[PDB]
Amino acid sequence: AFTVSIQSNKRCFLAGDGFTLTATVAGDEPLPSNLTYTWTKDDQPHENNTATLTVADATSENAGSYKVTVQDTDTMTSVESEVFLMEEAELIVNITEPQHFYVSSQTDVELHATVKFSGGKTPADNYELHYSWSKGEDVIDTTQDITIQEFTADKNGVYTVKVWGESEDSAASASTKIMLATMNVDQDVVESKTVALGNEISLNYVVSEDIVGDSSGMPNLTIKYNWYLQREGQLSPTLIGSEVGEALEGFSITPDGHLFKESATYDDTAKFWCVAKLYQQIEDETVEVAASTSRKCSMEVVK
Ligand SMILES: [Mg+2]
């Protein structure tokens, strides 16, 4: 038996890679030792006439269906190989974290990069990928995964990871936009309020989202208002309501996050406060990124 096959040092290639194809003769011993090789790519003639065909700085042009015909010059028997299909692949690079997200204050943000080859094959088992992370004009690390330490409003921005193989010709990128989310308190709750028995109880805590720089593309932010009261000797605080609309003990919450009750009772005499929580909407899900708790108001129902 006298057979031939193409053996390759790569399963596929990325732009700028090198590779080598090898006509490999098999079968019963001794195998014919005086041989000519004729190579074709996609049915078209190739100039290379040696046992190995080598490519350097590959481009799309080097992809294609290779075949070698080997002739034994003693007998003149020629044997052609099955084609070896050499395909060009591209890197798909991904970040595990959301494309855009807000973070809570005083945290270290971990980012992870993942990579796949477009054709579901790596070029070779040991093939080496290079990672480079940057924010704007500065390289923040050369590792696949990185950590942004002590994230502050001035680290708001777009972080990008670039990945490539043997040549930067094969580079592909992913980006994520990360911003600090905090709240500002524009109007604190009143420190004390005395209310005529039978008249209206109305309390407000005015806070807003505090976001520095360009918020474009970032997750929708919402605020929810949690209202409490605690009376004398009373052990744990009563949560009056959370959602807008009506609430417990005759209290309602307006659309703006205001606490309201029609007519006071001597039982409404208590401390009130609000805990306002900031949420970012990511996919179908909502997650608190900040909170503000109001000063307690001493609510006196008299006369
Ligand atoms: Mg980790």
Sheet with 52-55, strands from edge to edge, namely: 2-8, 19-27, 52-55
Q: How far apart are the first and last CA of the chain?
A: 113
Span from the CA of 281 to the centroid of ligand 1 (angstroms): 24
Residue type, 216: S
Span from the CA of 147 to the centroid of ligand 1 (angstroms): 9
Does residue 30 have a cis peptide bond before it, meaning omega lies within 30 degrees of 0?
A: yes
- DSSP class of 233: T
Q: Please give the structure tokens belonging to residue 7.
A: 């053996």
Helix, strand, coil content of the chain in percent (nearest 5): 5, 55, 40
Span from the CA of 107 to the centroid of ligand 1 (angstroms): 14
d(CA 82, CA 5): 6
Query: How many residues belong to the chain?
Result: 303
3-state secondary structure of 108: coil
The answer to whether the beta carbons of residues 81 and 22 sit under 8 Å apart is no
Nearest-CA neighbor of 2 among 22, 21, 29? 29
Cα angle for residues 219, 112, 213 (degrees, 5° grid): 35
Span from the CA of 149 to the centroid of ligand 1 (angstroms): 13
CATH class, 89-180 region: mainly beta
Cβ count within 10 A of residue 121: 12
Span from the CA of 141 to the centroid of ligand 1 (angstroms): 15
CATH of domain 181-303: 2.60.40.10
3-state secondary structure of 227: strand
Q: Please give the structure tokens belonging to residue 93.
A: 């690079």
Q: Please give the structure tokens belonging to residue 214.
A: 């360009």
CATH class, 1-88 region: mainly beta
The answer to whether the beta carbons of residues 89 and 17 sit under 8 Å apart is no
Span from the CA of 117 to the centroid of ligand 1 (angstroms): 22
User: What CA–CA distances, in Å, run from 208 to 105, 151, 218?
Assistant: 16, 21, 16
Return all residues near 107 (Cβ < 8 A) that are at least 6 apart: 151
Span from the CA of 28 to the centroid of ligand 1 (angstroms): 54
Instruction: Categorise residue 125: left if φ over 0, alpha if ψ from -120 to 50, beta otherwise.
Output: alpha
Q: Please give the structure tokens belonging to residue 142.
A: 């050369």
d(CA 171, CA 16): 10
DSSP track, 17-73 = --EEEEEEEEESSSPP--EEEEEEETTEE-S--SSEEEESS--GGG-EEEEEEEEET
- How do the domains of the chain map onto residue ranges? 1-88, 89-180, 181-303
Element (H, E) at 93: strand 91-95
Span from the CA of 210 to the centroid of ligand 1 (angstroms): 29
d(CA 275, CA 292): 6
Final resolution, Å: 2.0
Span from the CA of 169 to the centroid of ligand 1 (angstroms): 28
d(CA 163, CA 128): 10
The answer to whether the beta carbons of residues 4 and 24 sit under 8 Å apart is yes
> Residue 248 phi/psi, 5° resolution?
-70, 160
The answer to whether the beta carbons of residues 218 and 179 sit under 8 Å apart is yes
Nearest-CA neighbor of 279 among 243, 238, 227? 243
3-state secondary structure of 78: strand
Q: Please give the structure tokens belonging to residue 300.
A: 């006196």
- DSSP class of 294: P
Gap sites in the chain (C to N > 2.5 Å), preceding residue numbers:
none
Span from the CA of 111 to the centroid of ligand 1 (angstroms): 8
Q: Please give the structure tokens belonging to residue 246.
A: 């009506």
Nearest-CA neighbor of 67 among 32, 106, 41? 41
Q: Please give the structure tokens belonging to residue 133.
A: 């992370």
Span from the CA of 129 to the centroid of ligand 1 (angstroms): 18
Span from the CA of 70 to the centroid of ligand 1 (angstroms): 52
Sheet with 251-253, strands from edge to edge, namely: 201-203, 259-261, 251-253, 245-246
Indicate the pairing of strand 35-41 with strand 52-55.
Answer: unpaired
Same fold, 89-180 and 181-303: yes
Span from the CA of 110 to the centroid of ligand 1 (angstroms): 7
Span from the CA of 95 to the centroid of ligand 1 (angstroms): 12
The answer to whether the beta carbons of residues 86 and 8 sit under 8 Å apart is yes
Looking at 174-256, list the stretches that DSSP marks H as alpha helix, in order from N- to C-terminal side: none
Nearest-CA neighbor of 157 among 180, 131, 173, 184? 180
Indicate the pairing of strand 84-86 with strand 100-103.
Answer: unpaired
d(CA 33, CA 30): 8
Span from the CA of 23 to the centroid of ligand 1 (angstroms): 45
d(CA 98, CA 118): 22
Looking at the chain, list the stretches that DSSP marks H as alpha helix, in order from N- to C-terminal side: none
Span from the CA of 14 to the centroid of ligand 1 (angstroms): 28
Nearest-CA neighbor of 154 among 141, 136, 142? 136
